[PDB]
PDB file of C-alpha atoms in Angstrom:
ATOM      1  CA  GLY A   1     -86.458 -12.211-110.445  1.00  0.00           C
ATOM      2  CA  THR A   2     -86.175 -15.830-111.614  1.00  0.00           C
ATOM      3  CA  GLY A   3     -82.388 -16.041-111.222  1.00  0.00           C
ATOM      4  CA  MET A   4     -81.683 -16.945-114.871  1.00  0.00           C
ATOM      5  CA  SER A   5     -78.322 -15.389-115.767  1.00  0.00           C
ATOM      6  CA  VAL A   6     -74.741 -16.293-116.693  1.00  0.00           C
ATOM      7  CA  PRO A   7     -71.809 -14.742-114.761  1.00  0.00           C
ATOM      8  CA  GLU A   8     -68.374 -14.106-116.269  1.00  0.00           C
ATOM      9  CA  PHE A   9     -65.164 -12.385-115.196  1.00  0.00           C
ATOM     10  CA  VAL A  10     -64.626  -9.032-116.914  1.00  0.00           C
ATOM     11  CA  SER A  11     -60.930  -9.692-117.573  1.00  0.00           C
ATOM     12  CA  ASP A  12     -61.867 -12.997-119.238  1.00  0.00           C
ATOM     13  CA  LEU A  13     -64.369 -11.257-121.520  1.00  0.00           C
ATOM     14  CA  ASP A  14     -61.552  -9.075-122.896  1.00  0.00           C
ATOM     15  CA  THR A  15     -59.346 -12.024-123.896  1.00  0.00           C
ATOM     16  CA  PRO A  16     -60.520 -13.340-127.290  1.00  0.00           C
ATOM     17  CA  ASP A  17     -60.003 -16.806-128.719  1.00  0.00           C
ATOM     18  CA  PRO A  18     -56.221 -16.938-129.341  1.00  0.00           C
ATOM     19  CA  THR A  19     -56.752 -18.927-132.564  1.00  0.00           C
ATOM     20  CA  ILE A  20     -58.729 -16.116-134.232  1.00  0.00           C
ATOM     21  CA  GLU A  21     -55.584 -14.241-135.283  1.00  0.00           C
ATOM     22  CA  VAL A  22     -54.066 -17.429-136.729  1.00  0.00           C
ATOM     23  CA  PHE A  23     -56.938 -17.886-139.193  1.00  0.00           C
ATOM     24  CA  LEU A  24     -56.795 -14.265-140.371  1.00  0.00           C
ATOM     25  CA  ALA A  25     -53.081 -14.724-141.151  1.00  0.00           C
ATOM     26  CA  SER A  26     -53.756 -17.699-143.463  1.00  0.00           C
ATOM     27  CA  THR A  27     -56.822 -16.650-145.485  1.00  0.00           C
ATOM     28  CA  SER A  28     -57.128 -14.935-148.855  1.00  0.00           C
ATOM     29  CA  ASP A  29     -59.755 -13.550-151.217  1.00  0.00           C
ATOM     30  CA  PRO A  30     -61.204 -15.731-153.994  1.00  0.00           C
ATOM     31  CA  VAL A  31     -60.250 -15.066-157.614  1.00  0.00           C
ATOM     32  CA  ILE A  32     -63.175 -14.556-159.995  1.00  0.00           C
ATOM     33  CA  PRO A  33     -62.900 -17.035-162.901  1.00  0.00           C
ATOM     34  CA  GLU A  34     -62.234 -15.600-166.349  1.00  0.00           C
ATOM     35  CA  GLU A  35     -63.614 -16.746-169.714  1.00  0.00           C
ATOM     36  CA  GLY A  36     -62.377 -20.243-170.533  1.00  0.00           C
ATOM     37  CA  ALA A  37     -59.683 -20.273-167.861  1.00  0.00           C
ATOM     38  CA  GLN A  38     -57.426 -23.302-167.584  1.00  0.00           C
ATOM     39  CA  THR A  39     -58.551 -25.850-165.003  1.00  0.00           C
ATOM     40  CA  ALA A  40     -56.476 -27.796-162.495  1.00  0.00           C
ATOM     41  CA  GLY A  41     -57.280 -31.102-164.201  1.00  0.00           C
ATOM     42  CA  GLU A  42     -55.489 -30.153-167.422  1.00  0.00           C
ATOM     43  CA  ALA A  43     -52.272 -29.134-165.620  1.00  0.00           C
ATOM     44  CA  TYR A  44     -51.743 -32.066-163.220  1.00  0.00           C
ATOM     45  CA  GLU A  45     -53.141 -35.523-162.370  1.00  0.00           C
ATOM     46  CA  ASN A  46     -55.623 -34.909-159.543  1.00  0.00           C
ATOM     47  CA  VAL A  47     -58.788 -36.285-158.075  1.00  0.00           C
ATOM     48  CA  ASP A  48     -62.184 -35.439-159.401  1.00  0.00           C
ATOM     49  CA  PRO A  49     -63.533 -33.381-156.494  1.00  0.00           C
ATOM     50  CA  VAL A  50     -60.845 -30.736-156.950  1.00  0.00           C
ATOM     51  CA  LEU A  51     -60.285 -31.375-160.663  1.00  0.00           C
TER      52      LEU A  51
ATOM     53  CA  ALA B   1    -103.297  -7.740 -67.791  1.00  0.00           C
ATOM     54  CA  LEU B   2    -100.121  -8.837 -65.992  1.00  0.00           C
ATOM     55  CA  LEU B   3     -98.724 -12.139 -64.809  1.00  0.00           C
ATOM     56  CA  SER B   4     -98.821 -12.884 -61.084  1.00  0.00           C
ATOM     57  CA  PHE B   5     -95.119 -12.020 -60.623  1.00  0.00           C
ATOM     58  CA  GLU B   6     -94.737  -9.299 -63.264  1.00  0.00           C
ATOM     59  CA  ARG B   7     -95.488  -6.024 -61.458  1.00  0.00           C
ATOM     60  CA  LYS B   8     -92.207  -5.756 -59.511  1.00  0.00           C
ATOM     61  CA  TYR B   9     -90.147  -5.810 -62.737  1.00  0.00           C
ATOM     62  CA  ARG B  10     -92.026  -2.999 -64.541  1.00  0.00           C
ATOM     63  CA  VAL B  11     -89.853  -0.105 -63.404  1.00  0.00           C
ATOM     64  CA  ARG B  12     -88.773   3.050 -65.219  1.00  0.00           C
ATOM     65  CA  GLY B  13     -85.432   3.502 -66.961  1.00  0.00           C
ATOM     66  CA  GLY B  14     -82.904   1.672 -69.071  1.00  0.00           C
ATOM     67  CA  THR B  15     -83.396   3.307 -72.481  1.00  0.00           C
ATOM     68  CA  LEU B  16     -80.753   4.032 -75.105  1.00  0.00           C
ATOM     69  CA  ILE B  17     -82.687   7.087 -76.319  1.00  0.00           C
ATOM     70  CA  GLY B  18     -86.045   8.712 -75.581  1.00  0.00           C
ATOM     71  CA  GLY B  19     -86.329   8.703 -71.805  1.00  0.00           C
ATOM     72  CA  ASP B  20     -89.960   8.467 -70.713  1.00  0.00           C
ATOM     73  CA  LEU B  21     -91.427  10.001 -73.877  1.00  0.00           C
ATOM     74  CA  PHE B  22     -92.120   6.421 -75.060  1.00  0.00           C
ATOM     75  CA  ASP B  23     -91.578   4.383 -71.855  1.00  0.00           C
ATOM     76  CA  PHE B  24     -94.810   2.424 -71.488  1.00  0.00           C
ATOM     77  CA  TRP B  25     -96.594  -0.777 -72.513  1.00  0.00           C
ATOM     78  CA  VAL B  26     -99.527  -1.511 -74.831  1.00  0.00           C
ATOM     79  CA  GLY B  27    -101.028  -4.776 -73.654  1.00  0.00           C
ATOM     80  CA  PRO B  28     -98.094  -7.153 -73.215  1.00  0.00           C
ATOM     81  CA  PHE B  29     -95.871  -5.316 -75.696  1.00  0.00           C
ATOM     82  CA  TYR B  30     -93.180  -2.872 -74.626  1.00  0.00           C
ATOM     83  CA  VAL B  31     -92.976   0.372 -76.609  1.00  0.00           C
ATOM     84  CA  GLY B  32     -89.983   2.623 -77.075  1.00  0.00           C
ATOM     85  CA  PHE B  33     -88.251   4.708 -79.719  1.00  0.00           C
ATOM     86  CA  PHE B  34     -87.470   1.529 -81.650  1.00  0.00           C
ATOM     87  CA  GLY B  35     -90.999   0.210 -81.156  1.00  0.00           C
ATOM     88  CA  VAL B  36     -92.278   3.349 -82.895  1.00  0.00           C
ATOM     89  CA  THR B  37     -89.797   2.950 -85.749  1.00  0.00           C
ATOM     90  CA  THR B  38     -90.606  -0.768 -86.065  1.00  0.00           C
ATOM     91  CA  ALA B  39     -94.322  -0.037 -86.337  1.00  0.00           C
ATOM     92  CA  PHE B  40     -93.781   2.624 -89.003  1.00  0.00           C
ATOM     93  CA  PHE B  41     -91.449   0.544 -91.189  1.00  0.00           C
ATOM     94  CA  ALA B  42     -93.363  -2.743 -90.919  1.00  0.00           C
ATOM     95  CA  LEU B  43     -96.757  -1.167 -91.625  1.00  0.00           C
ATOM     96  CA  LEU B  44     -95.456   0.795 -94.617  1.00  0.00           C
ATOM     97  CA  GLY B  45     -93.826  -2.306 -96.102  1.00  0.00           C
ATOM     98  CA  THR B  46     -96.929  -4.468 -95.695  1.00  0.00           C
ATOM     99  CA  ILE B  47     -99.256  -1.855 -97.203  1.00  0.00           C
ATOM    100  CA  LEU B  48     -96.897  -1.351-100.151  1.00  0.00           C
ATOM    101  CA  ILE B  49     -96.819  -5.118-100.743  1.00  0.00           C
ATOM    102  CA  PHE B  50    -100.612  -5.201-100.923  1.00  0.00           C
ATOM    103  CA  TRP B  51    -100.700  -2.196-103.277  1.00  0.00           C
ATOM    104  CA  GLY B  52     -98.293  -4.024-105.582  1.00  0.00           C
ATOM    105  CA  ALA B  53    -100.492  -7.117-105.371  1.00  0.00           C
ATOM    106  CA  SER B  54    -103.571  -5.106-106.370  1.00  0.00           C
ATOM    107  CA  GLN B  55    -101.710  -3.622-109.336  1.00  0.00           C
ATOM    108  CA  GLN B  56    -100.451  -7.083-110.364  1.00  0.00           C
ATOM    109  CA  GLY B  57    -103.960  -8.543-110.652  1.00  0.00           C
ATOM    110  CA  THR B  58    -104.126 -11.253-107.952  1.00  0.00           C
ATOM    111  CA  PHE B  59    -104.725 -11.340-104.201  1.00  0.00           C
ATOM    112  CA  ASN B  60    -103.966 -15.075-103.930  1.00  0.00           C
ATOM    113  CA  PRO B  61    -101.324 -15.548-101.192  1.00  0.00           C
ATOM    114  CA  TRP B  62     -99.585 -18.286-103.188  1.00  0.00           C
ATOM    115  CA  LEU B  63     -99.443 -16.196-106.373  1.00  0.00           C
ATOM    116  CA  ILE B  64     -98.381 -12.700-105.239  1.00  0.00           C
ATOM    117  CA  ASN B  65     -94.931 -11.830-106.592  1.00  0.00           C
ATOM    118  CA  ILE B  66     -92.976  -8.566-106.320  1.00  0.00           C
ATOM    119  CA  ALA B  67     -89.709  -8.779-108.244  1.00  0.00           C
ATOM    120  CA  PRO B  68     -86.450  -6.794-108.529  1.00  0.00           C
ATOM    121  CA  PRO B  69     -85.618  -4.857-111.729  1.00  0.00           C
ATOM    122  CA  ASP B  70     -83.844  -5.997-114.890  1.00  0.00           C
ATOM    123  CA  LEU B  71     -80.069  -6.326-115.017  1.00  0.00           C
ATOM    124  CA  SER B  72     -79.824  -3.423-117.483  1.00  0.00           C
ATOM    125  CA  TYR B  73     -80.677  -0.928-114.716  1.00  0.00           C
ATOM    126  CA  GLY B  74     -77.427  -1.626-112.860  1.00  0.00           C
ATOM    127  CA  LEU B  75     -77.323  -0.054-109.406  1.00  0.00           C
ATOM    128  CA  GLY B  76     -79.746   2.789-110.166  1.00  0.00           C
ATOM    129  CA  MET B  77     -83.400   3.336-109.334  1.00  0.00           C
ATOM    130  CA  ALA B  78     -86.038   1.719-111.549  1.00  0.00           C
ATOM    131  CA  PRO B  79     -89.629   2.758-112.270  1.00  0.00           C
ATOM    132  CA  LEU B  80     -91.857   1.868-109.339  1.00  0.00           C
ATOM    133  CA  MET B  81     -93.945  -0.579-111.383  1.00  0.00           C
ATOM    134  CA  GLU B  82     -90.881  -2.300-112.901  1.00  0.00           C
ATOM    135  CA  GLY B  83     -88.800  -2.934-109.783  1.00  0.00           C
ATOM    136  CA  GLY B  84     -88.705   0.214-107.654  1.00  0.00           C
ATOM    137  CA  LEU B  85     -91.333  -1.123-105.258  1.00  0.00           C
ATOM    138  CA  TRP B  86     -89.014  -4.025-104.410  1.00  0.00           C
ATOM    139  CA  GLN B  87     -86.223  -1.570-103.564  1.00  0.00           C
ATOM    140  CA  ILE B  88     -88.462   0.529-101.298  1.00  0.00           C
ATOM    141  CA  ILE B  89     -89.734  -2.597 -99.522  1.00  0.00           C
ATOM    142  CA  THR B  90     -86.134  -3.786 -99.060  1.00  0.00           C
ATOM    143  CA  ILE B  91     -85.213  -0.495 -97.379  1.00  0.00           C
TER     144      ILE B  91
END
């Protein structure tokens, strides 16, 4: 009775964010590290945060 | 009681429905088929409003509130204590 609501068109509710499918086409699962695996620092010359 | 010039206008006839089954006056008010229906509907609505007020918990004229149902009921009929009273009073 207080008038607190949010209206939306039904056809608009069925159109998702078009950028959702772009992210799912560019993602991948992480790879569990093995015992004493080689790091990125020892193979190239990189910066400490990603070393 | 009539006005000084009123008696010559109070003739019989001119009804959409009913004839002289309801063709009279009560005080100054004219009664007809639609006077009867008006009385019924208005009295029922007012009494139902006061019943809802008594079940709400307040008789304060500023604070009485009878509300429509929740949006999850759609266009169907709600329980009388959760919004059905509003629908009956609207009718």
